[PDB]
A paper describes a structure:
Here, we show that mutations of this arginine residue (R121M/K) abolish the quinone-reductase activity, concomitant with disappearance of the N2 signature from the electron paramagnetic resonance (EPR) spectrum. Analysis of the cryo-EM structure of NDUFS2-R121M complex I at 3.7 Å resolution identified the absence of the cubane N2 cluster as the cause of the dysfunction, within an otherwise intact enzyme. The wild-type and R121M models were similar (with an overall RMSD of 0.31 Å), clearly signifying that global structural changes are not induced by the R121M mutation (right). The map of the wild-type complex contains a very clear map feature representing the cubane N2 cluster. This feature is replaced in the R121M map with a feature that is narrower and elongated, and that no longer supports the presence of a cubane FeS cluster. While this unknown cryo-EM density appears to retain the coordination of C150 and C180, no clear connectivity is observed from the tandem cysteine side chains (C85 and C86), which would complete the ligation of the N2 cluster. The R121 mutation propagates destabilization through the NDUFS2 and NDUFS7 subunits, causing further localized disorder in the quinone-binding channel. In contrast to in the wild-type enzyme, the side chain of NDUFS2-Y144, a quinone headgroup-ligating and N2-neighboring residue, lacks any clear density, indicating considerable flexibility in the variant compared with wild-type. We also note increased mobility in the β1–β2 loop of NDUFS2, known to harbor residues essential to quinone binding and catalysis, with only the backbone of residues 90 to 96 of the catalytic β1–β2 loop clearly visible. The flexibility of the methionine side chain is likely due to it sampling the large void created by removal of the bulky dimethylated arginine.
Respiratory complex I (NADH:ubiquinone oxidoreductase), the first enzyme of the electron-transport chain, captures the free energy released by NADH oxidation and ubiquinone reduction to translocate protons across an energy-transducing membrane and drive ATP synthesis during oxidative phosphorylation. Yarrowia lipolytica is one such model organism that is well established for studies of complex I. Complex I from Y. lipolytica contains 43 subunits, of which 14 are the core subunits required for catalytic function and 29 are supernumerary subunits with varied roles in assembly, stability, regulation, or independent metabolic function. The terminal cluster of the FeS relay is a [4Fe–4S] cluster, referred to as cluster N2 that is located at the interface of the NDUFS2 (NUCM) and NDUFS7 (NUKM) subunits. The arginine residue (NDUFS2-R121) in this motif is particularly intriguing, owing to its proximity to the N2 cluster (3.7 Å) and its unusual posttranslational modification: R121 has been shown to be the target of symmetrical ω-NG,NG dimethylation on its guanidino group.
Author numbering:
A (entry chain A): 1 to 14, 49 to 128
B (entry chain a): 2 to 87
C (entry chain e): 2 to 69
D (entry chain K): 1 to 89
E (entry chain N): 2403 to 2871
F (entry chain B): 71 to 210
G (entry chain J): 1 to 185
H (entry chain b): 1 to 78
Write the structure that this text describes.
Amino acid sequence: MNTFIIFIILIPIVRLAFNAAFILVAILFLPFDLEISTLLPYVMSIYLVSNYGFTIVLLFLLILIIGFVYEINTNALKINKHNKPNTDSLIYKL
Amino acid sequence: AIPFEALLPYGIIFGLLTAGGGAMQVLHVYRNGGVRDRFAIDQWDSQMMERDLRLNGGQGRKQVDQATAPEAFKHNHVWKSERPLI
Amino acid sequence: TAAGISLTGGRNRCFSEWQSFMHCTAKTDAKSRAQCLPNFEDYMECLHHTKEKARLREIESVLKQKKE
Amino acid sequence: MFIGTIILVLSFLGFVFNRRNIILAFICLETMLLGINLILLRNSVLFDDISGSLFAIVIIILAGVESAIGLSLLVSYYRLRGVINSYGI
Amino acid sequence: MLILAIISLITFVSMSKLSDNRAIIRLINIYLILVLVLDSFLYLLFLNNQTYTVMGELLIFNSFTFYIDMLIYFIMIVISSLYGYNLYNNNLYKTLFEPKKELIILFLINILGALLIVHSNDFITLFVAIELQSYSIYLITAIYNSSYKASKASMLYFFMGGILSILIAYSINTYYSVLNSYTLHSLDSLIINTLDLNLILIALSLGLLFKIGIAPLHKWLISIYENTPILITIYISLIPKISILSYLVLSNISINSLVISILAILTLLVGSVGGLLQIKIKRLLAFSGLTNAGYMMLLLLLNNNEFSYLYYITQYSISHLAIFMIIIFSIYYINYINNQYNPIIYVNQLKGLIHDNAYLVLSMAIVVFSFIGIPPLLGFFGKLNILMSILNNGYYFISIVLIVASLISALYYLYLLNVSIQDKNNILINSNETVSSVLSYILSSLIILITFGFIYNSLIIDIFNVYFN
Amino acid sequence: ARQGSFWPVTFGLACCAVEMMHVSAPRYDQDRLGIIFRASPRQSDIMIVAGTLTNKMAPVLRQVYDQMPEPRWVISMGSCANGGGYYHFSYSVVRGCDRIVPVDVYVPGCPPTSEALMYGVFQLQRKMRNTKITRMWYRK
Amino acid sequence: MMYLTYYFIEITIFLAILCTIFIISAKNPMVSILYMIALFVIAAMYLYLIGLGIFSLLYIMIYIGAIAVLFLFIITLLDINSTELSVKSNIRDLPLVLISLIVLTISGLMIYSNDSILINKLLEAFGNDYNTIITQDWFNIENTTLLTTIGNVLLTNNAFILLVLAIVLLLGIIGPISITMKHKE
Amino acid sequence: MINANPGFWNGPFRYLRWSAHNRPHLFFAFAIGIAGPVAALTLTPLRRKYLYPDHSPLPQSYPLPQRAREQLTGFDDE
Amino acid sequence: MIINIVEILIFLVCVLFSVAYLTVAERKTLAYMQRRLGPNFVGYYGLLQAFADAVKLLLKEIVLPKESNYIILVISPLITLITALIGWVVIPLGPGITLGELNLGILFSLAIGSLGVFGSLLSGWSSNSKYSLLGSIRSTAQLISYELILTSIFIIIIMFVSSLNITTIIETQRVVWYCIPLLPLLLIFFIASVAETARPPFDLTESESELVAGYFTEYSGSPFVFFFLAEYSNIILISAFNGYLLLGGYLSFNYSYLFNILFNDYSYVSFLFEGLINSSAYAIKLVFLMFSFIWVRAAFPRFTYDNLINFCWIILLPLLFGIFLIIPSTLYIFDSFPTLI
Amino acid sequence: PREAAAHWVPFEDKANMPDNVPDVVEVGATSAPLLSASYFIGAKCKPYNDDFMLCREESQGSGAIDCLKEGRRVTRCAVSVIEDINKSCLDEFRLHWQCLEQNNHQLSGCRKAEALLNKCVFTKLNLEKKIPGLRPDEEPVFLKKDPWIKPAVDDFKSVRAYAEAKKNGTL
Amino acid sequence: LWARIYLMPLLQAEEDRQTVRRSIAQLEREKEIMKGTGFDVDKSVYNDGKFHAPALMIPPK
Ligand SMILES: CCCCCCCCCCCCCCCCCC(=O)OC[C@H](COP(=O)(O)OCCN)OC(=O)CCCCCCCCCCCCCCCCC
Ligand SMILES: CCCCCCCCCCCC(=O)OC[C@H](COP(=O)(O)OCC[N+](C)(C)C)OC(=O)CCCCCCCCCCC
């Protein structure tokens, strides 16, 4: 019986439409989360992988920045409006 | 600071957490027997603390400077018999 | 490529027998490779612990029926 | 070695004998991957080796990406049909 | 070269509208050709079968893998010309065959996953690469999300491919549980005989082989190849089979398996029998791909199987492209368009094609008789080598099943030719539109190779007796 | 507890909301007494029928009142809600919010001064302070 | 006192069985996802039991934190109909369910051993009888743990797999966009 | 429109001024990300030559000598 | 194990009482910023307001709507409180003066801040009505989109010190606090903290749903109370992450020369005065940052969901994936990669 | 190796060593004085420790049974070191290892007592601390005049002694 | 590190001696449990003639 062990037990026991940016934000959270979680071993082995695993993780991050670039310039997460304001010109046949 | 009435509850919070941290310090110290708590202990430091428990009479973090060990030390050796994992 | 490495970043528990077996493979060609049998069996014993387990089962049988 | 095999088998059986919906199929896939990782990590401990944990972390990555792609594919199906009925794929 | 392609295309395509997609496909087509021309001299490194291990011991490079790499690129410069060069500049053929934006990226990523498999030396690289090849091909089926059947197809292929990736990983973890290794080079005659690994390795072979349609789990892949668009069917049907069969051939896993013998027999029987009543083209050609997967499965049991595999996989790929290309060209001369994605479905729509374009039918006959194994077409010299190897190693009942399967498959192969040389009312007499130049030259070149490549067989044998021996 | 935390619901404040908002203002802070206005009935105890209670609105009012969890009170702010006031003889008016809901305190005025509202709340706090919760059970 | 914590692994095995049956039997799928979360927790427990809390936490922050958030994020937005567990519809599978259970379990257990006689391959799996001694040595000098080792090998010995997982994640970005996002312009 | 894109190939420097004015949130991100690898390539040898050199590596394990054993004495029994 | 019970009860009392009076501190601080006063009538200067709101809500009906679930609306607030509370275990108030004292304390907090989302996820399923299930989705997308940005900062600073022990991370800040070399990360971490708690200027869903008939947290009784002891504790917790990551935690002026001058020996007085000084530095830092949550609330208007997801994935993430490259380069330039201890 | 997992009962062995293996005293010194004395031991037991690890390497599996003599000589060299310390430099050793125990065995918090100990043992036993593998350029961390990292609380007795010893010139 | 290095050989010597004592006493124990039987307990399951600590035992109870 440790104080962490005593505490981690005590506390508990005492039709529609959607925009596809709503769903992409979740679907894209996965890979970016796996990237930032795969970066943990680097930060905890950063000395032992001196200057080799540094370069390796940079090529890793650059490859991932590519996909981020693709996401931005597609404008995936932007919401798009249908009822546009008219910008044609007013032209009268004579 | 002008508005003392607004800072009183901050004074409650400040004093409660303050006394909580100082009291936990004294409690950890009384647990250890007059020494500050250890932290970031690895395999080696744990194995050495167990070796201390073998040399002193199981008295926690009490240290001993003797160049020669009591004869119990040779027979107090422990191995650890683990359950098969499934 | 990451073979023979432990959880602490060092040599595993059964590495040494694997080293003897790999040495004797390098010493021998496919015809003479039969010589590597006991080394391989030692490796498998370190891994899976079968013959020692059966040894202990015999000991336990003697403690179990021949006394009661 | 036991718990992983059991989750794997029961989840394969619940994948195969699901006459109800599809989210059970996704779930059974994820549970199969879980049971694999537990088998492998048990063996990696007993051998005191690292290749098992490496393949485990790799499985976690690949399974998460699997679920991402699967749940985009489902969204495409739903785009076109509007209802994911019990016996449709 | 693939990687710099995939990296550059992501940026260059995000910067580019929907209207540049054809030109971007044309660019990567020419780039792949420049690779295959200028970096092809690296075959010298594999003199006397000098084999190299790379990135530690994760990858393996020998003459087998290099030739497979060139073949996958030759496939991928022909499969790209089909998207980047419009046949006819008509509104119908714009609507029928228009590339999407992300398609080409997924193709190259699938090329990468294909090549990491064949080049793999450790199971970890295999599991990473088969997941890459698998996920990319889930998306390729699904990219045409404006169709109902493709949506159904990608969903089924996802689930039934996930199950097999589970089976593969279960097998690998078992091998590691037994032996504390992820590398097959850690096997040898001693370890094979000494340890009961037969179950643990056939489970690998099956988990890889059921991903290519091996019987009796052929139906799901056949429903997919039928339900997906024709220009996707021509890619999904080939590249995954090359990759996985090549990995299983290079690694001499199943030397004399009884299970593999049984299943391979069943594939030849199923793929020959069940394709007789089919009225649709794609199901017919899928059952053809299955029986050819049967023939190529039969050399997983040999231990000296490189020449027979390399010659058959090459002629299979060539005939497979050419026949699907003939079917694509014939859409101009039919009367009814069935879909925006599958303009041609039923074999009875090719009726009278001789009276419209006869030399298209000459190409179809050459290609069909190549599939059947009529000499002097390349298919003869491919099925001959398989018969030499299995009879040299001791499979006799299987050779008879092989002969019987070829005869039975002549019937569904000749259904096309029979209806094509039939007679038709309302023939074509003139047409001011003209098919593209490049696609005609590609089809012709594949035809001329199927026809006359028997001339070079000795030269190929000499080169093989140096670089593979 | 019931006094020091006195949370009305945002509903009922249609007309004459200015004088009620002035009781949320600096010079007369209601939050100093623990008053907090809430969007939702289910967390609230008090309803303030300010302004005109029209016939097009009374059912919505009764819904919000039944949705409140007991204990619940009602306090009628203004004349237009006590007896209809100025629009008593109109076609589109309930001549009193009594007709719909039960009222505990009636603040007079049109618009009642912020001080009148605070005094009414101090009368309501007195009502609940001379309430018998358990002593009545010890009688019952 | 000692043996109060002896059978925790068997408890987790029993609990995983329960959560699997509950995932299979639940009416509304949302409940089935909650039971999947219970199963990932039990797995994290078991991994702590055998000395890998790092993976317990990585699981809780990957699977539960993202994948299951997403599964609820989907079933909240889609009209995923169902068919509650029944007896007219699913009883027919009982003989095949039972045969498949017995065979697949006994094979999954026999497979891990190298004995030549079949029955002994299973009786070896059922030989979990003997305790494993743990000795203490003094050769490890650093504070290397499992995560540091994983970083070292993954970023030095197996760099290629890392630089391929980057492309798997590029697929995870780029495929879902292509599928969901219609680049009409 | 008022401040649309002039194109990277129709004047780099003019594009860089436009981006710093209208899209800083990308420009300064690119500048940050390029300033690391580039400086690591360029400035590192200067720091190694002029400021201070690279440290001598850490033991990492018992440094087993590369020699053959020598016969010693002292501290024997008795 | 008696003193372990004493130490737990001290901690729980201190944290929960701090939460209760953070409610009052929020209200009085916000008031004086608005040139008013109060609560200052329910106690001796309002020091009993929070317990009055509680006791009123515990004597209130437990009312459940017709078409709702009971178990989900009940356990989900309870599990939110639990998950928010267990993050307090790894939080140090002195060098090793911690209940957990794990070697993976960062990862524990990071996994528990991932478990937190489920309260908002299960809220929308408490209402079978259709709009609530989209309002919860908006409020989940903000959290999972901003947890990427909080994490990324945990990793950026752990590049400086290669250990997941919280005490070790604080002890490396004797030389300098990591808010001086990475000052912009202080803003980013504080912005994202305010977002993850769904606090203003990031209170989109509670406001957008306060207008609508639902899509909010329409609970009552005890679940209200637990949700308001889980919001005002996740606030302190996220403020603590800022403290022990960037602001030195418990660190302060070197009290070497003073303790040398005044004591002469290591007694059970010096240990107390030391733990007082350490915790007081840790506390005043939490106070200034809780003040900052309130300061921000008093000023800035609200965001919309498009502006907010655009802020995250197009402005913050690029800067961070840039910083991921500049800092390892900055260490490689100078031969200063940290060791594992 | 690994640590115990999921369950583990300590178990001893009440038996004695074989008669063909002679008897050797044990060091009997705990973590802190041992860590203080590490450098003085290594400066004196270097050849013996090296011969021990070499015979372990040459044996190739039988190290536990072939290296007993070498481990015995190592243990005796260590005992001679600590006996020389306790006989001669006791109080300074106690200052060092108590200053350590009131920290996390970080040597940075004990530099004053470490200085007094190095001085005394160098004057009497002729044993100096040395960190090898360094260049002549690198400055060893225990001799830096104004280090970046300093203890939370400099120990009291250590500080009084350091000041009195500078006044007495002993340092 | 260099301090923990200068200490390693000493401590591992201790552990080798206790390893020897226990691994030999275990065999002298089984000899007495296997008195009247032709079961060689000294016969090593390893075919090489190296020392090998048990790595297994019987549960104490
Ligand atoms: C992936 C989805 C997730 C679910 C996974 C489920 C668990 C997976 C189980 C294992 C993996 C699946 C294997 C797929 C079937 C193919 C197995 C195979 O082909 O191996 C055969 C192989 C021998 O074949 P071969 O090497 O070709 O020829 C030389 C023969 N001396 O090797 C063998 O000889 C096989 C060994 C023979 C023993 C087989 C064990 C059967 C025991 C079952 C007994 C059941 C009891 C009786 C009936 C009960 C019903 C009441
Ligand atoms: C290679 C591109 C394939 C793409 C498809 C085109 C077919 C090209 C075949 C050339 C193979 C070769 O010349 O090689 C012979 C190979 C081994 O030689 P190698 O190590 O690969 O060196 C080759 C170096 N090149 C690439 C610079 C030339 O033997 C084989 O088993 C191949 C069997 C293939 C049978 C198919 C015959 C087709 C007729 C070809 C009429 C020109």
